[PDB]
Amino acid sequence: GMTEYKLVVVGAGGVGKSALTIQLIQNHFVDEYDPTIEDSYRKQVVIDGETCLLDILDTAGQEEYSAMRDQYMRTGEGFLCVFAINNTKSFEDIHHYREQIKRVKDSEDVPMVLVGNKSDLPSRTVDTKQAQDLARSYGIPFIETSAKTRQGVDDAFYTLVREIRKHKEK
Ligand SMILES: Nc1nc2c(ncn2[C@@H]2O[C@H](COP(=O)(O)OP(=O)(O)O)[C@@H](O)[C@H]2O)c(=O)[nH]1
Ligand SMILES: [Mg+2]
């Protein structure tokens, strides 16, 4: 089969994980989607000339059993850590997601991208400078997205793929 990249979208409820995933996969903005639904989506894409499959888990938080969380984190190759630029708590929550993924994968080298979503809104509590500082501290890219307008969306996911490639070549 063509190469598959197993991506996982994490972040607080309300940041736009589902909207980002559906915009990536289907090229439409779904502005109401139950925050408690967790599902995987697939799309065949071309990234830097490589035809590949993205297998994307749109997470929704706690699981029936924590073992289910640990399972998807171990299976997942790269993580989109999403906050909303107008929600400081969601940004603070990134610290927890960063830690939890590393802790489960038992790794200090996990492909991730920091995503600040909802960039179409003028309302903002997290300045780009602050988000860049966090991404720098993690050694990962930072991308601002709007799932609403699709700005930055392919970049966020394709950049994550490129981070996975960097990890795999070691
Ligand atoms: N303006 C704007 N609203 C967004 C964006 N992404 C998501 N939303 C809205 O934010 C809310 C939460 O989005 P959702 O995708 O359900 O977030 P999730 O809980 O992280 O899956 C919904 O009201 C969406 O319409 C965005 O980029 N811009
Ligand atoms: Mg959702």
UniProtKB/Swiss-Prot annotation:
Keyword field contains Cell membrane: yes
Location of the motif Effector region: 33-41
GO molecular-function terms, A-Z: G protein activity; GDP binding; GMP binding; GTP binding; GTPase activity; identical protein binding; LRR domain binding; protein-containing complex binding
Glycan-modified residues: T36
Effect of P35L: In NS3; characterized by a defective GTPase-activating protein sensitivity and a strongly reduced interaction with effectors
Effect the entry attributes to changing Q23E: In CFC2; exhibits an increase in intrinsic and guanine nucleotide exchange factor catalyzed nucleotide exchange in combination with an impaired GTPase-activating protein-stimulated GTP hydrolysis but functional in interaction with effectors
Residue numbers carrying N-acetylthreonine: T3
Effect of A60T: In GASC; also found in bladder cancer; somatic mutation
Effect of G13S: In GASC and JMML; also found in lung carcinoma; somatic mutation
PANTHER family cross-referenced by the UniProt entry: RAS, DI-RAS, AND RHEB FAMILY MEMBERS OF SMALL GTPASE SUPERFAMILY
Family of the protein in this entry: Belongs to the small GTPase superfamily. Ras family.
Record's function text: Ras proteins bind GDP/GTP and possess intrinsic GTPase activity. Plays an important role in the regulation of cell proliferation. Plays a role in promoting oncogenic events by inducing transcriptional silencing of tumor suppressor genes (TSGs) in colorectal cancer (CRC) cells in a ZNF304-dependent manner.
Name of the protein in question: GTPase KRas
Protein's organism: Homo sapiens
